[PDB]
Every structure is written in C-alpha cells, then in structure tokens.
Scaffold this active site. Structure first.
Site, PDB file in Angstrom:
ATOM      1  N   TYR A  80      42.616  32.073  50.072  1.00  0.00           N
ATOM      2  CA  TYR A  80      42.792  33.313  49.332  1.00  0.00           C
ATOM      3  C   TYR A  80      43.305  34.392  50.277  1.00  0.00           C
ATOM      4  CZ  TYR A  80      41.475  37.947  47.659  1.00  0.00           C
ATOM      5  OH  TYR A  80      41.483  39.292  47.351  1.00  0.00           O
TER       6      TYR A  80
ATOM      7  N   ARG B 230      38.974  43.152  33.079  1.00  0.00           N
ATOM      8  CA  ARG B 230      38.784  43.875  34.330  1.00  0.00           C
ATOM      9  C   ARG B 230      39.949  44.764  34.747  1.00  0.00           C
ATOM     10  NH1 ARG B 230      34.778  42.198  37.350  1.00  0.00           N
ATOM     11  NH2 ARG B 230      35.980  41.804  39.267  1.00  0.00           N
TER      12      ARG B 230
ATOM     13  N   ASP C  68      44.740  43.309  48.710  1.00  0.00           N
ATOM     14  CA  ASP C  68      43.310  43.415  49.009  1.00  0.00           C
ATOM     15  C   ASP C  68      43.094  44.257  50.252  1.00  0.00           C
ATOM     16  OD1 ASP C  68      40.607  43.027  49.696  1.00  0.00           O
ATOM     17  OD2 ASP C  68      40.543  40.961  49.145  1.00  0.00           O
TER      18      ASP C  68
HETATM   19  N1  NDP Z   1      37.840  43.399  41.914  1.00  0.00           N
HETATM   20  C1  NDP Z   1      37.859  43.620  43.228  1.00  0.00           C
HETATM   21  O1  NDP Z   1      36.743  44.137  43.913  1.00  0.00           O
HETATM   22  C2  NDP Z   1      39.106  43.319  44.013  1.00  0.00           C
HETATM   23  C3  NDP Z   1      40.281  42.911  43.375  1.00  0.00           C
HETATM   24  N2  NDP Z   1      41.424  42.729  44.115  1.00  0.00           N
HETATM   25  C4  NDP Z   1      42.663  42.294  43.467  1.00  0.00           C
HETATM   26  O2  NDP Z   1      42.877  43.014  42.271  1.00  0.00           O
HETATM   27  C5  NDP Z   1      43.453  42.176  41.279  1.00  0.00           C
HETATM   28  C6  NDP Z   1      42.618  42.271  40.009  1.00  0.00           C
HETATM   29  O3  NDP Z   1      41.238  42.300  40.324  1.00  0.00           O
HETATM   30  P1  NDP Z   1      40.170  41.622  39.317  1.00  0.00           P
HETATM   31  O4  NDP Z   1      40.267  42.343  38.024  1.00  0.00           O
HETATM   32  O5  NDP Z   1      38.876  41.544  40.018  1.00  0.00           O
HETATM   33  O6  NDP Z   1      40.752  40.118  39.139  1.00  0.00           O
HETATM   34  P2  NDP Z   1      39.968  38.908  38.409  1.00  0.00           P
HETATM   35  O7  NDP Z   1      39.206  38.136  39.404  1.00  0.00           O
HETATM   36  O8  NDP Z   1      39.046  39.401  37.292  1.00  0.00           O
HETATM   37  O9  NDP Z   1      41.130  37.971  37.817  1.00  0.00           O
HETATM   38  C7  NDP Z   1      42.252  38.538  37.197  1.00  0.00           C
HETATM   39  C8  NDP Z   1      42.928  37.528  36.280  1.00  0.00           C
HETATM   40  O10 NDP Z   1      43.749  36.635  36.999  1.00  0.00           O
HETATM   41  C9  NDP Z   1      44.018  35.547  36.147  1.00  0.00           C
HETATM   42  N3  NDP Z   1      44.269  34.314  36.899  1.00  0.00           N
HETATM   43  C10 NDP Z   1      43.506  33.773  37.901  1.00  0.00           C
HETATM   44  N4  NDP Z   1      44.089  32.625  38.305  1.00  0.00           N
HETATM   45  C11 NDP Z   1      45.203  32.426  37.569  1.00  0.00           C
HETATM   46  C12 NDP Z   1      46.149  31.415  37.559  1.00  0.00           C
HETATM   47  N5  NDP Z   1      45.929  30.294  38.240  1.00  0.00           N
HETATM   48  N6  NDP Z   1      47.185  31.470  36.653  1.00  0.00           N
HETATM   49  C13 NDP Z   1      47.294  32.536  35.782  1.00  0.00           C
HETATM   50  N7  NDP Z   1      46.350  33.536  35.796  1.00  0.00           N
HETATM   51  C14 NDP Z   1      45.320  33.476  36.675  1.00  0.00           C
HETATM   52  C15 NDP Z   1      42.814  35.396  35.228  1.00  0.00           C
HETATM   53  O11 NDP Z   1      43.289  35.411  33.901  1.00  0.00           O
HETATM   54  P3  NDP Z   1      42.539  34.643  32.705  1.00  0.00           P
HETATM   55  O12 NDP Z   1      41.130  35.237  32.576  1.00  0.00           O
HETATM   56  O13 NDP Z   1      43.330  34.852  31.470  1.00  0.00           O
HETATM   57  O14 NDP Z   1      42.443  33.133  32.994  1.00  0.00           O
HETATM   58  C16 NDP Z   1      41.977  36.634  35.498  1.00  0.00           C
HETATM   59  O15 NDP Z   1      41.578  37.247  34.290  1.00  0.00           O
HETATM   60  C17 NDP Z   1      43.466  40.760  41.839  1.00  0.00           C
HETATM   61  O16 NDP Z   1      44.777  40.429  42.252  1.00  0.00           O
HETATM   62  C18 NDP Z   1      42.573  40.839  43.057  1.00  0.00           C
HETATM   63  O17 NDP Z   1      43.039  39.997  44.088  1.00  0.00           O
HETATM   64  C19 NDP Z   1      41.431  42.931  45.470  1.00  0.00           C
HETATM   65  C20 NDP Z   1      40.272  43.335  46.122  1.00  0.00           C
HETATM   66  C21 NDP Z   1      39.110  43.539  45.390  1.00  0.00           C
HETATM   67  C1  CB3 Z   2      31.755  37.918  46.518  1.00  0.00           C
HETATM   68  C2  CB3 Z   2      32.476  38.763  46.061  1.00  0.00           C
HETATM   69  C3  CB3 Z   2      33.473  39.705  45.520  1.00  0.00           C
HETATM   70  N1  CB3 Z   2      33.895  40.842  46.442  1.00  0.00           N
HETATM   71  C4  CB3 Z   2      35.136  41.655  45.993  1.00  0.00           C
HETATM   72  C5  CB3 Z   2      36.396  40.974  45.468  1.00  0.00           C
HETATM   73  C6  CB3 Z   2      37.505  40.815  46.348  1.00  0.00           C
HETATM   74  C7  CB3 Z   2      38.713  40.186  45.895  1.00  0.00           C
HETATM   75  C8  CB3 Z   2      38.860  39.684  44.572  1.00  0.00           C
HETATM   76  N2  CB3 Z   2      40.028  39.074  44.140  1.00  0.00           N
HETATM   77  C9  CB3 Z   2      40.148  38.585  42.849  1.00  0.00           C
HETATM   78  N3  CB3 Z   2      41.239  37.967  42.395  1.00  0.00           N
HETATM   79  N4  CB3 Z   2      39.118  38.727  41.988  1.00  0.00           N
HETATM   80  C10 CB3 Z   2      37.920  39.319  42.345  1.00  0.00           C
HETATM   81  O1  CB3 Z   2      36.926  39.401  41.386  1.00  0.00           O
HETATM   82  C11 CB3 Z   2      37.734  39.827  43.667  1.00  0.00           C
HETATM   83  C12 CB3 Z   2      36.531  40.469  44.118  1.00  0.00           C
HETATM   84  C13 CB3 Z   2      33.167  41.126  47.618  1.00  0.00           C
HETATM   85  C14 CB3 Z   2      33.820  41.063  48.899  1.00  0.00           C
HETATM   86  C15 CB3 Z   2      33.126  41.337  50.099  1.00  0.00           C
HETATM   87  C16 CB3 Z   2      31.745  41.667  50.078  1.00  0.00           C
HETATM   88  C17 CB3 Z   2      31.104  41.934  51.354  1.00  0.00           C
HETATM   89  O2  CB3 Z   2      31.622  42.680  52.202  1.00  0.00           O
HETATM   90  N5  CB3 Z   2      29.902  41.316  51.565  1.00  0.00           N
HETATM   91  C18 CB3 Z   2      29.404  41.080  52.977  1.00  0.00           C
HETATM   92  C19 CB3 Z   2      28.711  39.722  53.054  1.00  0.00           C
HETATM   93  C20 CB3 Z   2      27.564  39.729  54.061  1.00  0.00           C
HETATM   94  C21 CB3 Z   2      27.314  38.325  54.585  1.00  0.00           C
HETATM   95  O3  CB3 Z   2      27.465  37.359  53.802  1.00  0.00           O
HETATM   96  O4  CB3 Z   2      26.961  38.180  55.784  1.00  0.00           O
HETATM   97  C22 CB3 Z   2      30.453  41.180  54.060  1.00  0.00           C
HETATM   98  O5  CB3 Z   2      30.415  42.166  54.835  1.00  0.00           O
HETATM   99  O6  CB3 Z   2      31.321  40.276  54.145  1.00  0.00           O
HETATM  100  C23 CB3 Z   2      31.042  41.740  48.828  1.00  0.00           C
HETATM  101  C24 CB3 Z   2      31.739  41.468  47.614  1.00  0.00           C
END
Ligand code: NDP
Ligand code: CB3
Ligand code: NDP
Ligand code: NDP
Ligand code: NDP
Ligand code: CB3
Ligand code: CB3
Ligand code: CB3
Lengths: 266, 255, 253, 265
Positions: free
Chosen positions: A172, A12, A159
């Site tokens: 979180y 991702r 975030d």
């Molecule tokens: N995607 C989104 O819509 C959003 C993402 N973000 C932020 O962006 C960043 C990346 O997003 P996204 O790609 O969705 O992230 P992911 O949810 O896909 O996770 C990223 C990686 O974090 C690693 N990880 C989780 N927990 C641990 C831990 N305990 N120790 C070591 N590694 C860990 C995992 O590695 P592994 O697979 O190797 O275990 C995973 O692949 C995150 O920090 C997230 O908070 C913020 C808002 C929205």
């Molecule tokens: C789930 C998920 C991932 N996400 C995004 C998201 C955010 C942080 C992350 N952080 C990390 N580490 N990994 C992720 O994959 C990740 C994904 C979402 C967050 C909010 C809504 C949202 O706004 N939905 C409505 C819900 C309506 C209701 O339940 O009443 C809202 O307004 O809150 C949707 C998806």
C-alpha cells in the site's frame, strides 16, 4: 455544467468529495466496485436535488483482466471516462479516490493471496489512476481547442503519513509512493493541455473503530490539532478548492490534510 | 468581524492578500516599511468600502535596533500585534509576507554584509518568529470563552528554494528557516488551535516565465493570494504545518 | 597532507569527527568556545600520535560582536579559516559541527536576543561566513596549487521535520543550515567544493523509540559517515543530506 | 565470507557495484536477464581473481508468470535468494539494481502497454519487494546464533524523479514505489537488524547514442564537473552503505547526482 468523475464515490471520503463537487454545480459520475447500494442511494439523492446530475459506474480497478476476450484494466478505465462523455459529452475533473488498504507483512492460499494483493493494492492506488489519467487526457487532446473546458483538474488522493510508514503495509505504501510519482509526472506532461494534477493527502480521516475504545482514542490523541481524526468534509473541501478556478496556478503539488500528524515522532 | 495582520501589505502579493482577506470580511492591519503612500492609499480604499476596516502600521522588520533606549525587533513585532488589539481588540490571522530579496554572493563591504544578514534574515525569518510569538501570547492570554474560532498564521515561503537561485544564499537560508518555523509553530500552537501553514509562490508578478510548465507565465497576485485566503477559511480548519506550492509546476523542472 | 577545520571539536560528535579525519591523515584545526581543556587534551593526543597534526582555536560563533573596534562574527569566522592557512598553508575540509541547543518556547527579556544570536549564529550564520571564507581562500588560490578534494560538511538534524516541542529557533536555524547546504553546493560547484549535510537523530545521549537497535547512536556511527563524504570516493556527491538516525525519522506518535 | 546478491549485475552500475563488493571480500551472486555473455564474463573474472567468489543466475524480473504450472515473479525472486543459500549457505547483502527504462507517454498497442507496466513496475518495484521479502524470510528462519552481523539492502533509486523526465510516467511511478519500499522495509526489518537504504544516481555513464553536442549539452547541466558520473562514483557509495561503518544508517537515500537535483529549467 462541468462533469466530475470520482472513483470509489459510494461512501466515506469519496462520497464527501462527490457531494462537495455536486454542491459546486458539477454533474458527478460516481464510481464503485462492491458498494452498489450506497452508490445508487447517493445518485438518487443527488439526482433528486438536481435532475440528471449523477450517474454510477461499476468497475474493479485491480490490475487484473475480467469477464467480458478478457477485459483489461485499461479498457475498464477508458470506459469509466467514456461513460462521462457518452452521458454528458464531457469530463472536466477526475478524482482518483478509490483505494484498497490492508496489511502485506514482510515477516510472519499464500500464493493467490500475495498475487491478488499486489494487483489489488497497486491497481486501485496507482495503475488504475494512471490509465484513468491517460484516458482523461486523450479525451481532452481529442477535443478541438475551441470546445475544451476552461478548468480541467485531476486530484489524486494520496497519504500524508506514508513517509512514516505504517508497519506491515509495504505494498500500500509503495502504491501511494507511485501515486505521488504519477502526480508529479502527469502535472508536467499535461501542463500544455492546461490539465492541472495535484494530490491531497489525509492523515487520519473518519477512523474505523474495530478495536478497544482506548486504542481508538489513543490513535486520535496523537494528532496534534484537535487530538482527533478528521471529518470527511475537512478533507473533501480541500479537494473542491483545488478544483476551483481560484486554484488554476496550482499543479504538481500535495496538500496535507492531517492536523499536523506528519510532524510527530515516536 | 475578525482581524488580519498582513506584513508588507502595501503592494504586489501583500496588497492582494490584504484585499483578499478584506473581501472575506476581515478588518485588516496593513504593515509597511518604506511604502507609506501605497499603504495609506490601500487603507483609504478599504476604509471607504467599509468604515473602520483597515489601518496602517510602519516597522522595519530587519533584525536591528531602531530609534525610540534603542527599540529591538521583538518589541517592534509585539507592537505590531498590539496595534491590532488596541484598535479592534483582536488578531485572528497573521500573514508573514514582508520579505527582502537580493543577492548575497559567496564568490566575488563589511557593513553591507551585516546589514544584508539582519535585513534578509529579519524580514524572512526572525520577525515572523517574534510576530508568531506575540500572536500566540495574546491568544493564550485571552480567556477561552472569549477566543476566536479560527486562528490562522500564513508564512509566505518560496516554492523554488530547494532549487536555489544562484547567488541568493542568505535569502534562501532565511526561507528555509521560515519553513522550519512553520513546522515548529504548527506543532507547538496546535493546543491553542492556531493553525500555521505556508504558501510558496514560484514566479509571481515579475516586473524566465516561459519555463513555467503551466501557462508558460508567472502568476498573478490573485492566483497566490486566493490560496492564502482559502487556508485562512474555516473549510481549511484541519490543515496545519504544511506548504502549498503555487508555482504552476515550476519546481518540477530541471536544467 | 590535507587540512580539516572542525568547529566545536572538543567533545562528543565534533571530537569523533576530528579523530576520524585525523585517522585518515588529515591535519586538524580543532575549534572550541568554552571547552579549552578538552580541546587542548585532544590536540595533545593527536599531536603525540603525529607531530604537528593538530591545533586549537577559540571563537564564539554566536552572531554577536566581541571585544578585541568590536570584532564581528564574520571576522572571527575568517580568522578561523585563516588560522589553517597561516599554520599549514591550506584548508581542504570544513565541518560545521558547533551548535547550541536549548528551548525557546512560544508559550510559557534580552535572553530572547542572546538565544537568537547564539542559536542562529552557531547553527547557521557562522557556517555561512565560514563557508564564505573557505571559498574565498580556494578562489584566491591559483588553480595549479589547489587541492583535489575540497569538502564542506554541515551537521544538520534528521528530526527537524518532526520538530522537537519548544525548540523553534534551533529548528529554524537547522532549516537555514539545510538551505545553506543546497545553495553553497550549487554556487561552489565550479570550484569543485562539495557541500553536504549529515543529520544525526539521537547520538550519544546526555531511545527505545529508535527502530534500529532501540538505542541512540555512538559518535563513531555518525562521524564515520562524515569521513566517507570527505573521501575521494564520494567526489560526485554534493548538495545532499545523509541521515544517520537508525530509522527514527520514519516514526509517528 | 559474506554473500551479496546483485540484480542486473552484468554491466554498467550493476557490474561496478558487484566489482566493488567483490573487492571488499564478498562472494557475489550476479543476476541477469538478457546479458548472459556479459554476466558470465564477469563471473569468470571474479572467479579467476578469487575461486568460488561469483555465480550467475538468470531471471526475468517483470511482473509476469513464466513457463516452467506457470512460474510467478515471487517464486522467481525466492529462487534468486535461494540460489545464494544453496551455493554459499548465506545472503548478507541484496542490491536491487535491475531496472527497465523507457518512455510511457500520456499523450499520443495492447501488448506494448500491458507489457510495459509489468516490466517497468516489476523490475523497479515489485521484484525488489519480493526479493526483500525472500531475503528477510531467510534471515528470520536463521537461528540468531548463525545470523550475519551486517545485513544490508540497497535500493537503486533515482535522484531526479522528483523533477520527472517528460514521458517516463510509469518508470517514475515505479521509482516512487521503490522509495516507499525503502522506508517501509527499513522500519519493518529493523528488529532483524536488516538495514534498507536507497542510492539515487542522477546522470551516470550516460549512453551516447545521440549527436555529440546533444550528449555534451545533457552533461553540461550537472553543476558539479559538468558531466555524468562514472560507475564507480555511484557504486563506491553503495559499498560504503553496506560496510559496518554505516550500521546506524537505514531508511534513507543518498543522492549521487553532482547537484543535478538542485537545478531549475
Ligand atoms: N481515511 C483516512 O484516514 C485516509 C485516507 N486516505 C486516502 O483517501 C482516499 C479515501 O479515503 P477513505 O474514504 O478512507 O477510503 P476507503 O478505505 O473507505 O475506500 C474508498 C473506496 O475505494 C474503493 N476501492 C477499494 N479497492 C478498489 C478496487 N480494487 N477497485 C475499485 N474500487 C476499489 C471502495 O469502493 P467500494 O466500497 O464500492 O468497493 C471504497 O469504497 C483513499 O485513496 C485513501 O488512500 C489517505 C490517508 C488516510
Ligand atoms: C489502521 C488504520 C487506519 N489509519 C488511517 C488510514 C490510512 C490510509 C487509508 N487508506 C485507504 N484507502 N482507506 C483507509 O480507510 C485508510 C485509513 C491509521 C493509520 C495510522 C495509525 C497510527 O499512527 N497508529 C500507530 C500504531 C501504534 C503501533 O502499532 O505501535 C502508529 O503510530 O503507527 C492509526 C490509524
Ligand atoms: N513574487 C514572487 O515571484 C515570489 C515571492 N515569494 C514570497 O512571497 C512574498 C511576497 O512576494 P512579493 O510581493 O514579490 O514581495 P516583495 O518583494 O514585493 O516585497 C514585499 C514587501 O516586503 C517589505 N519588506 C522588505 N524588506 C523589509 C524589511 N526590512 N522590513 C519590513 N518590511 C520589508 C516591503 O515593504 P515596503 O515596500 O513597504 O518597504 C515590500 O513591499 C515574499 O515573502 C516572497 O519571499 C516567493 C517566491 C516568489
Ligand atoms: N547529538 C545528537 O543526538 C544530535 C546532534 N546533531 C547535530 O550534530 C552536531 C554535533 O552534535 P553534538 O556533539 O551533540 O553537539 P553538542 O551539543 O555537544 O555541541 C557541540 C559543540 O558546539 C559548540 N558550541 C555551542 N555553542 C557555540 C557557540 N555559541 N559558539 C561556538 N561554539 C559553540 C560547543 O563547543 P564548546 O564545548 O567548546 O563550548 C560544543 O562542544 C550539532 O550540530 C548538532 O546540532 C543533530 C541531531 C542530533
Ligand atoms: N545510469 C543512470 O544515469 C541512472 C541510473 N539509475 C538507477 O541505477 C540503477 C542502475 O543503473 P544502470 O546501470 O544505468 O541500469 P541499466 O539501464 O544499464 O540496466 C541495469 C540492468 O537491469 C536489468 N533489467 C532491466 N529490466 C529487467 C527485467 N525486466 N528483469 C530483470 N532484469 C532487468 C538489465 O539486465 P540484463 O542486461 O541482463 O537484461 C540491465 O543490465 C538502475 O536501477 C537505475 O534505475 C537512476 C538514475 C540514473
Ligand atoms: C531575479 C528575480 C525574480 N524571480 C522571482 C522572485 C522570487 C522570490 C522573491 N521574493 C521576494 N521577497 N520578492 C520578490 O520580488 C521575489 C521574486 C526569479 C526567480 C528565479 C528565476 C530563475 O529560475 N532563473 C533561472 C536560473 C536560476 C538559477 O540561478 O539557478 C531559471 O531557472 O530560469 C528567475 C526570476
Ligand atoms: C532533549 C534532548 C536531546 N535529544 C537529542 C539531541 C538532538 C539535537 C542536538 N543538537 C545539538 N547541537 N546538541 C545536542 O546535544 C543535541 C541532542 C533528544 C531529541 C528528541 C527526543 C525525542 O524524540 N523525544 C520525544 C519526542 C518529543 C516530541 O514529540 O516533541 C519522544 O517521545 O521520543 C529525545 C531527546
Ligand atoms: C534520456 C535519458 C537517460 N537519462 C539518465 C538515466 C536515468 C535513469 C535510468 N534508469 C535506468 N534503469 N537505466 C538508465 O540507463 C537510466 C538513465 C537522462 C535523464 C535526464 C536528462 C535531462 O536532464 N533531460 C532534460 C532535457 C533538456 C532538453 O533537451 O531540453 C530535461 O529537461 O528533462 C537527460 C538524460
């Protein structure tokens, strides 16, 4: 040839950031916890593109001690940064991307579940980043001025939506708040070393679709710009820019990459 | 070949922003108020580098009526945007950079109070509003298939206004209004894929600096304009309604 | 006996704030623009409850000149504050509550000029002049004869960071009001004049979305906060905002 | 008679908040870690003023297990809230005031760092979380017909963390987390009518363990009055936010900093 350390770089957003930096000429240390296969595949791709331009290191970033005297999270973080110095003699960029994300409801086994979530959610999102930054800074400080890099940059993946909390994700959300604090504090303290610290906060990026299509479409439809979640590149490109020399005056701030989602109300 | 409209483009940050965009391939409309000489010199440089890549337009952006019936600020703003369409048939980027900046103390006339209000509020907030309105109207009036693929509006804000500069209330207010315009415009203009963001310098090209945590100096024009250019690039196509501080950590300080 | 100047005090929140302050012992100057009947009715009620405890003054707070040499907004604002001194010899509290609120769409013509002057005047520019006039009078008052609790409250908006589609000018004006709060607080600190903001979300609607109670607020639920910020217990608060939105600003689409 | 649980209530702001609430008619559960003497002296004063209107509970709010199977922080937090129900059959207000505050520099052992993390993060963020959870659990478990009409949680935050204090990263981070807890808790607990707000002092009852001129310079930075605040100047705001007149406020912060957060270097 500069070096970038990217935590949770296997898939991702993490991968996109690693690829982005690699495309800019960086050698990349790809961190991972459980995704060894994906991480090694990425290393292979990058290395094939450019010999000795990628390595991988495994590490649980949860705030717990592991099997070796037990190994602490700090040590594990210091070793992460050390792996860069041992292999390439440097570490110019650190991207705190690794992050756990699951519900910790306040309302309605339970003992280990609550204690494990805290260490996990807070470790990956906040505490590991802190130790990683500490280790990163200690190495720069311990480097004689004349041999220091000219563009140290730390990016904290935050975030864009935590100020409008996601129901049932308190820990979180708290950890993200702490990460925002780490960005501001680290930027200030590390300024004298010319280590910039900034945050990049996605809103909805590559949204997992484990739900009825209509519910997946409904979520995307909420984002005012394009009515869709973002692609990995749409986030990582911003991370890469903030790491470029053209961004050398930016530190202690956040760049939202949310297509205006944080502008909405219920 | 896209077009960018940059207000107050004659010198300092404005000039750097215009040069930055021009280097990326944009044809640039350089607005100015009093700095005709510098604006024209900049146009000449840009045109020599690349024929028909720059023009200059004069306009007082204060919230007042000027001499031609009296011409209002809106009309003046609409003509600014029109100049782009009349000359190049398009306007892809608008950078609200022009801005007055001087004291309006609350603690110690009538004319200088009304002139400051119109001036400080016009350039910093009201003109940008009208300019954004004119910009959006032209895009809306353009048939979908003929629209650009990267409309971007950058509002030059201020990274330090939350820690107000003693004696600069109106300016500080106008900047707050500009921040509001950024958020509102981004939301309303999203359907037309017009992104609206803000860039807030702290201390840039001071004609104090030791207090800046990073480098202990004010920034160069390029250190700010580069950010403006990046936000206008297609790589930033998911960013809208936000601010990027370019202050070297200044907004992190306390007295 | 302290004096409070409340703009747009005729109805809704303004009236509740005026009543709240009056209940605390304040003599109240009720400003109004078009609502003379309601403002005079309120003055009568307050005066009957306590003789010489309320007056009403009319003024257009739009950023335009009015016919008695044309009279400017600043003059009109200065006269507003002066009315307090002329009648009671003091002005301890100023509440910038008066506010126009209507759409100014960017997508789908002097109405743009009237809106600009109106929306910006009531919400931002009048408040600025009013604060200026307020501060001048305090500064011109000899230290020994000054009040012990000068407080200026700016009625802002808890939801402007999540703009209401089509309300750009109003939203901008509120942003400027927020700026005025921070700037005024800092500059007026030496005179011990506190300046804070109160931002309602949904109050006394002309809903199911509000996390708390799933309803808009009552006027008292907002005005009580304005009253507390004016009390001596809040003497260390200045330059900040208190949201009274029942958690509305925490939501997403 | 409503009940208020105040953590770190022994001295300074905690004591002022407890006294404030007590003056409003609340029975008060005074929590303390190391300050037994101060806490008991306060309980005595309050009890003399009004019989059975105060009790003390000791608890380390650091994120570590303690000796009795080892006892976890959550259990310790749950017992804190329970103590209120066991003694008075209710808990209407929770004030997360307890907080560690010391440097954790990034630039230049094993125990001091691991201990600092658990301590700084426990008192400032994690304990508050568990305390809120426990508080919410007991309200939910109470039949609607027996519930209080004014549940209020106040998180003592910090008005100056956005302009971080050099060398206090963990503390600053923990405060950031506390801010997140406020917003998240307010949203989730809205259906139960439990309001959650923050109060962030700037400089209050500033410790004078330094040269007078240094101490004066520090206060002089505050735009309003050029001095740190008194305990009451903060606690009065906490008490107001807990009153029924504030029943529409939730998920927000009230800065009590005399304009300090408006300054630049
Ligand atoms: N995607 C989104 O819509 C959003 C993402 N973000 C932020 O962006 C960043 C990346 O997003 P996204 O790609 O969705 O992230 P992911 O949810 O896909 O996770 C990223 C990686 O974090 C690693 N990880 C989780 N927990 C641990 C831990 N305990 N120790 C070591 N590694 C860990 C995992 O590695 P592994 O697979 O190797 O275990 C995973 O692949 C995150 O920090 C997230 O908070 C913020 C808002 C929205
Ligand atoms: C789930 C998920 C991932 N996400 C995004 C998201 C955010 C942080 C992350 N952080 C990390 N580490 N990994 C992720 O994959 C990740 C994904 C979402 C967050 C909010 C809504 C949202 O706004 N939905 C409505 C819900 C309506 C209701 O339940 O009443 C809202 O307004 O809150 C949707 C998806
Ligand atoms: N420089 C800094 O340290 C900081 C700058 N900023 C913001 O960045 C932007 C650019 O900064 P900077 O380059 O210093 O700006 P300047 O102060 O140098 O002014 C920019 C231009 O604005 C134009 N202008 C001023 N008033 C009017 C008006 N009444 N009508 C039309 N044009 C007007 C002037 O054009 P002309 O000369 O042709 O008359 C001037 O050249 C501004 O918006 C500013 O608010 C924010 C924080 C710090
Ligand atoms: N109600 C809500 O849900 C919200 C309110 N607010 C803010 O709270 C404050 C009060 O709210 P509310 O009671 O609804 O306000 P109203 O919309 O009811 O208006 C208040 C008063 O402002 C006066 N006014 C309007 N325009 C002018 C002008 N041009 N010159 C002089 N006076 C003028 C009017 O006085 P008159 O009738 O005599 O002409 C009116 O009575 C406002 O500042 C508003 O922005 C913020 C968010 C939400
Ligand atoms: N005072 C100020 O200028 C500022 C204060 N604040 C915040 O306001 C609140 C109160 O301020 P203040 O009175 O100065 O706080 P104090 O520093 O005086 O400490 C408050 C109490 O917290 C308790 N405590 C500390 N660590 C723990 C822990 N490990 N477990 C259990 N209890 C613990 C202590 O209880 P005991 O003595 O019994 O061990 C102490 O009495 C705090 O949350 C603080 O962060 C914010 C900004 C400024
Ligand atoms: C003047 C000027 C130019 N500037 C920079 C500045 C800011 C906005 C602008 N805006 C525009 N349109 N044009 C400019 O040239 C411009 C310049 C300064 C701003 C702040 C401090 C400063 O921080 N001063 C003190 C105290 C501030 C206070 O009063 O609270 C400090 O904190 O160190 C110094 C210089
Ligand atoms: C209209 C009006 C009055 N109001 C309240 C309101 C706000 C400010 C005021 N300001 C002033 N001066 N006077 C008022 O009467 C006034 C009234 C409303 C505000 C928001 C929503 C709302 O949130 N609606 C949509 C979101 C809209 C969007 O996403 O852009 C929702 O789904 O909840 C509804 C009504
Ligand atoms: C220390 C401490 C306690 N404090 C207040 C404070 C804050 C949080 C707390 N939190 C807790 N739990 N307990 C406390 O006793 C406490 C005290 C201070 C905070 C800031 C400055 C300050 O403004 N420092 C300037 C230094 C100026 C200079 O010397 O150049 C700065 O620039 O940061 C001073 C003291």
């Amino acid at each position: 040839v500069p070096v970038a350390l990217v935590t949770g770089a296997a898939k991702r957003l993490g991968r996109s950031i690693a690829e982005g930096l690699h495309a800019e000429g960086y050698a990349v240390c790809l961190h991972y916890h459980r995704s060894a296969a994906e991480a090694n595949a990425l290393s292979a791709t990058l290395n094939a593109r450019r010999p000795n331009s990628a390595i991988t290191v495994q590490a649980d970033l949860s705030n717990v001690a592991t099997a070796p005297a037990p190994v602490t999270l700090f040590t594990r973080c210091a070793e992460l940064v050390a792996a860069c110095y041992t292999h390439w003699g440097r570490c110019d960029v650190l991207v705190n991307n690794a992050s756990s994300f699951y519900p910790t409801p306040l309302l309605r086994g339970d003992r280990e579940a609550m204690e494990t979530a805290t260490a996990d959610l807070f470790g990956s999102n906040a505490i590991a980043p802190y130790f990683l930054i500490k280790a990163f800074a200690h190495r720069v400080a311990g480097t004689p001025a004349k041999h220091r890099g000219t563009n140290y940059s730390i990016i904290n993946m935050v975030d864009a939506m935590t100020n409008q909390p996601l129901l049932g994700y308190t820990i979180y959300t708290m950890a993200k708040g702490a990460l925002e604090g780490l960005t501001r504090s680290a930027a200030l303290e590390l300024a004298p070393l010319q280590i910039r610290v900034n945050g990049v906060g996605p809103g909805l990026s590559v949204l997992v679709d484990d739900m009825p299509p209509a519910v997946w479409e409904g979520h995307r439809s909420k984002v005012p710009l394009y009515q869709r979640d973002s692609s990995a590149a749409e986030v990582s490109d911003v991370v890469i820019f903030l790491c470029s020399s053209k961004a050398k005056y930016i530190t202690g701030t956040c760049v939202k990459v949310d297509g205006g989602y944080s502008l909405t109300r219920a």
